[PDB]
């Protein structure tokens, strides 16, 4: 299940954004990597109600629809 | 020995027109991605196997269309209203096996 990650990594330039976007709606972030901070953060699911899923999407299509999609049609 | 054939390639006036194609061949396509790139080297478009799930480059969007020919050995780039800052090489791709490419030249 981590193919996907690193694809929405790549698919998106600014990490920092859907993390501005996901500010308090969160330590992570002493991990290195640009991408650490994006594999781990799909390792908080259990924290993520659905409103949070609702979040990350909404802000992608929000950001670039195309993208909401792949990871809906996935 | 892998092969990849870029064409379609050529000089146009913005607003108009640019087919580009490339031909695969020597191994099973259909079970990988292809794609197009111009030269950085910034990505272009992005087709994954089976058709699916399409990926175009934000300069792409609404205009560029990548295609897919499975039956078999052809990829389709699709360029309207041509712009000379997107007059490039395109380079078609998979695999780690990139196309020698085409020259595009747009004024």
């Known amino acids: 299940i981590d193919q996907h990650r690193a694809a929405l990594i790549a698919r998106v330039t600014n990490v920092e954004w859907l993390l501005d976007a996901l500010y308090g709606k969160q330590a992570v972030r002493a991990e290195p990597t640009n991408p650490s901070k994006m594999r781990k953060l799909f390792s908080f699911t259990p924290a993520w109600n659905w409103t949070c899923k609702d979040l990350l999407l909404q802000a992608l299509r929000e950001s670039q629809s195309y993208l909401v999609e792949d990871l809906e049609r996935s | 020995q892998v092969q990849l054939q870029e064409s379609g390639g050529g000089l146009v006036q913005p607003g108009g027109s640019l087919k580009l194609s490339c031909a695969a061949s020597?191994?099973?396509?259909?079970?990988?991605?292809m794609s197009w790139y111009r030269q950085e080297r910034e990505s272009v478009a992005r087709?994954?196997?089976?058709?699916?799930?399409?990926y175009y480059a934000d300069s792409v969007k609404g205009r560029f269309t990548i295609s897919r020919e499975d039956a078999k050995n052809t990829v389709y780039l699709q360029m309207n209203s041509l712009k000379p800052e997107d007059t490039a090489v395109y380079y078609c791709?998979?695999?780690?096996?990139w196309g020698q490419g085409t020259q595009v030249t747009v004024s």
């Open positions: 087709i994954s196997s089976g058709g699916g799930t399409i």
């Open positions: 791709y998979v695999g780690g096996f």
């Open positions: 020597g191994f099973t396509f259909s079970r990988y991605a």
